[PDB]
A paper describes a structure:
After purification of the IgE Fc:026 sdab complex, we obtained crystals that diffracted X-rays to a maximum resolution of 3.4 Å and determined the structure by molecular replacement. The asymmetric unit contains two copies of the 026 sdab and one IgE Fc molecule. During the process of structure determination it became clear that the crystals contained the IgE Fc Cε3–4 fragment and not the IgE Fc Cε2–4 as expected. The 026 sdab binds symmetrically to the IgE Cε3–4 forming a 2:1 complex where each sdab:Fc interaction buries ~800 Å2 upon complex formation. The contacts involve surface areas that are clearly different from the FcεRIα binding loops; thus, the 026 sdab does not inhibit IgE:FcεRI interactions by blocking the binding site. The sdab bridges the Cε3 and Cε4 domains from each ε-chain in the IgE Fc dimer with the Cε3 and the Cε4 domains contributing with 30% and 70%, respectively, of the total buried surface area on IgE Fc. The CDR3 is inserted between the Cε3 and Cε4 domains and contacts several residues in the D–E loop of Cε4. Residues D99 and D110 in the sdab possibly engage in electrostatic interactions with the side chain of IgE K497, and E108 appears to make hydrogen bonds to IgE Fc residues 498–501. In particular, mutation of residues E108, D110 and Y112 in CDR3 abolished IgE binding suggesting a critical role in the interaction and supporting that the contribution of CDR3 to the interaction is essential. A direct comparison shows that within the sdab complex IgE Fc adopts a closed conformation similar to that adopted upon CD23 binding, which is incompatible with binding to FcεRI.
Residue numbers in the entry:
A (entry chain C): 1 to 123
B (entry chain D): 2 to 124
C (entry chain A): 336 to 545
D (entry chain B): 334 to 545
Write the structure that this text describes.
Amino acid sequence: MEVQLLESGGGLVQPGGSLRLSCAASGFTFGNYDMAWVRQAPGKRPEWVSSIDTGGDITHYADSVKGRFTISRDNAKNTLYLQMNSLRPEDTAVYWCATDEEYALGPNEFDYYGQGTLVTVSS
Amino acid sequence: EVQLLESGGGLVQPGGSLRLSCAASGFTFGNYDMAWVRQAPGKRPEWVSSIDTGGDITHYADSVKGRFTISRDNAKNTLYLQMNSLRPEDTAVYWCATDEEYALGPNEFDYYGQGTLVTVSSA
Amino acid sequence: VSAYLSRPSPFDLFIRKSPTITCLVVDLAPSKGTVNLTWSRASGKPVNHSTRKEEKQRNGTLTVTSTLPVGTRDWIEGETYQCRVTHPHLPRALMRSTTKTSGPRAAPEVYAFATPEWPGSRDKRTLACLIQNFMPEDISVQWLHNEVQLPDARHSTTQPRKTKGSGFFVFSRLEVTRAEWEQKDEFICRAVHEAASPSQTVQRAVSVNP
Amino acid sequence: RGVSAYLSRPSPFDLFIRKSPTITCLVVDLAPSKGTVNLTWSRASGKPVNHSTRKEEKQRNGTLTVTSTLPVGTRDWIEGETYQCRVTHPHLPRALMRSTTKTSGPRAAPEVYAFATPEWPGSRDKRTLACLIQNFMPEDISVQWLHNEVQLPDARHSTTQPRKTKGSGFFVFSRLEVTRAEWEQKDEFICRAVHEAASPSQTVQRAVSVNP
Ligand SMILES: *[C@@H]1O[C@H](CO)[C@@H](O[C@@H]2O[C@H](CO)[C@@H](O[C@@H]3O[C@H](CO[C@H]4O[C@H](CO[C@H]5O[C@H](CO)[C@@H](O)[C@H](O)[C@@H]5O)[C@@H](O)[C@H](O[C@H]5O[C@H](CO)[C@@H](O)[C@H](O)[C@@H]5O)[C@@H]4O)[C@@H](O)[C@H](O[C@H]4O[C@H](CO)[C@@H](O)[C@H](O)[C@@H]4O)[C@@H]3O)[C@H](O)[C@H]2NC(C)=O)[C@H](O)[C@H]1NC(C)=O
Ligand SMILES: *[C@@H]1O[C@H](CO)[C@@H](O[C@@H]2O[C@H](CO)[C@@H](O[C@@H]3O[C@H](CO[C@H]4O[C@H](CO[C@H]5O[C@H](CO)[C@@H](O)[C@H](O)[C@@H]5O)[C@@H](O)[C@H](O[C@H]5O[C@H](CO)[C@@H](O)[C@H](O)[C@@H]5O)[C@@H]4O)[C@@H](O)[C@H](O[C@H]4O[C@H](CO)[C@@H](O)[C@H](O)[C@@H]4O)[C@@H]3O)[C@H](O)[C@H]2NC(C)=O)[C@H](O)[C@H]1NC(C)=O
């Protein structure tokens, strides 16, 4: 087992737009790990975004993104998703999917990070 | 695995002499530097002396310099400490010690023996 | 495959006064058979009933954890406990043993500090406690607020490490919120260790605002 | 199988200050000397590999350690090259392989706080200096102590392993013992941290003094 996580779906969108991020998992049994998303906006300290349960019953969100983004996963396709709605200039950042051997539901210094993808929100 | 067994403690009058023997077993004694440490009642431990692998290098604490003599015999797997001109101040429990990395100076040694008691008094 | 055997914590030994030793077996590529682990003494005296726990890890590793309550006097007087591990696809049984560490004894000294305030965190502050000058390595560090011990997860404590002639040392880091210090501005760093006197504990209190 | 192998990343001091990063492959061999260990450096990209040095020494308990160090390109490492250390020995059934590349993920600059312990009974010629480096990530960091504008030997101080804070970044503690002669000479001791995300030149530092 070696953890490989590859993000996709970044790009440029106008404020008020929406975007869907797909993180593909490979090299481990995806259905055993909690998953999370982390972002870092240019020149700002990293911020934990959201996290998902193993089965999907538990969702957690930071207050800054709560009710705008919705996290989900498909365990048969080995793919984690983040659906972003009502984007603001505040949300321009690089986004990573992450996981940890012990704790992944909350903010943490996760053991594994993907490669990241960029979301630029502007006119 | 390092097993160290002290012997030779007892009761002696001021100015007397006593000889401490630490028997080594379970490892290649000829590869390790050796040292002696003591703890007097209600006082913090004090490093006493240390011996080189071959026997060429000797170190002593200032309190015991020229009064004690350390030695080792590698064919008999035995470390010795010869104490001359003993004082009441030298009443302590004595341990022989060794370490995988550093043993010449005072240190938090990896291995200690079982200890033996030396009482210097008028008796 | 690897096996480990712990010593009692000083908190278990001296505060609760019911020490326990844990034998831990970590099994990669598992489930060919069933792991059998047997507690024994070197002296041959009876061993108490042991708990046994099996948990599957996220990476597919199986861990087998067994914990034995041991006699308070027996451990202090140098008893030796052995955990012997049998499994059918293991070629020869793994044996681990444990006993009180011999050698000199030294009381910890405890110093507790409060980091300066930093932009971005004016609703929490970082508390830092230094425990040093002690030996043997075994120590338990605890944080108390309003006379009640905080959960262990609130703080993180470094592994003990040598100073080359002064004894072992450890640091403790705790994050406290504004509500907690507004409630009561006293946070207590307490160390449990064999050579501490009078009751095997030493502590120092720190406050955010002097 | 009685043998174990490990592979490092460049230290931040080598990478950003010395500016000659190096990666070290370590093979620790219990019950050794049946044959000779051959380890071959390779890349994932397939580009040439620099010449590597080798040191093999016997431990006190009779274990053999085989250490090889490879200089890596400063440009190559930062831009994500992947290096593999491949270990061959005649009593191994299959070769051991370890690989390394810069850790991915978000990055945060350290904060440094330096303290001076109170006087302690028993010595008027020594004091303990304590430095806290925290709130950074990734884990890779190098911590250094400077006095009289010159870096102290590594052995003078001891620095805790990086460990998580559950959402605030990694942290390490450093402990230094200073003698009376040194602070009488100049009462300023500087704790300096080298880290990738430190700015402006990959360094952050704080000075501490024995007597306020
Ligand atoms: C798949 O994932 C799993 C993850 O679970 C992984 O399995 C882990 O593998 C490693 C080894 O391969 C294991 O690590 C070992 O952990 C041992 C357990 O130590 C725990 O308990 C210690 C004792 O606690 C008792 O005693 C103390 C007082 O003594 C008392 O306070 C307690 O209440 C209790 O009664 C304890 O010391 C230790 O806690 C410290 O360390 C952890 C480590 O991160 C840290 O989280 C804490 O903050 C604390 O500082 C821990 O809680 C341990 O005994 C053992 O350590 C020895 O060996 C190493 C290696 O030589 C030495 O360096 C060290 O000096 C010791 O001699 C070792 O660290 C780990 O425990 C496995 N799993 C679990 C569930 O624990 C698999 O490897 C993964 N898959 C693959 C392919 O790797
Ligand atoms: C017989 O005796 C021998 C010798 O005593 C003993 O052999 C030891 O065997 C163990 C395993 O069985 C080895 O343990 C491993 O050690 C690895 C070496 O780490 C060294 O180098 C690390 C990398 O340094 C490079 O990079 C850094 C920055 O990254 C840079 O600063 C450097 O300049 C360099 O370029 C370094 O991190 C490490 O330093 C830490 O550890 C020392 C330990 O004393 C400590 O003093 C430091 O302050 C610092 O905390 C060290 O210098 C290491 O990579 C490896 O780590 C992995 O495993 C552990 C445990 O599973 C994990 O917790 C960890 O996350 C890693 O996955 C592991 O620690 C050990 O090195 C041997 N000792 C020697 C000298 O070779 C035998 O076991 C004995 N026989 C028996 C039967 O027991």
